[PDB]
Amino acid sequence: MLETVPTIKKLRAYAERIRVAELEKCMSKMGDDINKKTTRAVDDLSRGIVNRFLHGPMQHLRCRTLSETLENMHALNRMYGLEK
């Protein structure tokens, strides 16, 4: 249903803020050890962790009673402060 769509967007952005922030700190702490394959590997790590974390919640934000889907949305809103 359409009502949870913005929550999906907001949760993506929340996740990404964290991913980028930590990925940047990591790269800074590696100095001259950054090369293509190493850089690519750490990038894949950052989004690999984020994506596998986001899968459950976001799968459950779509398509199951509509009522539980809304509660999943509300819980996310509370837990991550998506609706400031």
Binding site: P6, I8, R12, D44, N51, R52, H55, Q59, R62
Partner: protein, 119 residues
């Protein structure tokens, strides 16, 4: 070679984007896009395409942003190389959400959710 300039243009564009300068960044990624196309390097063409998409969203030009994120899908299909695909699907969905087309955004989110565990 000039591959050198391509690397520079991508890094520079990524820097301007991180510093609240999407217009300046758009200019850089645009050059990088031309370079990657002229150099026939699809992998970097997808990166350049994403940079343009990101620069445009940042400017609020979501409809134009979709055109450039869609390239990532198009390039990937022409090349059978799926890097950036998952992010592209999600970015496009983000754009449609900002445009109010929640129906179409949901369809792209669905495609993107289905990839969240694969790598």
């Amino acid at each position: 070679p000039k591959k050198q300039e391509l690397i520079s243009k991508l890094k520079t564009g990524k820097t301007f984007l991180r510093n609240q300068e999407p217009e300046k960044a758009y200019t850089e990624f645009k050059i990088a896009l031309e370079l990657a196309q002229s150099l026939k390097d699809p992998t970097e063409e997808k990166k350049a395409a994403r940079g343009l998409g990101a620069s445009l969203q940042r400017q609020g030009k979501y409809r134009e942003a979709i055109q450039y994120h869609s390239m990532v899908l198009a390039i990937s299909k022409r090349e059978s190389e799926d890097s950036g695909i998952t992010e592209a699907y999600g970015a496009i969905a983000d754009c449609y959400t900002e445009l109010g087309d929640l129906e179409k955004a949901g369809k792209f989110y669905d495609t993107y959710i289905a990839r969240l565990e694969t790598d």
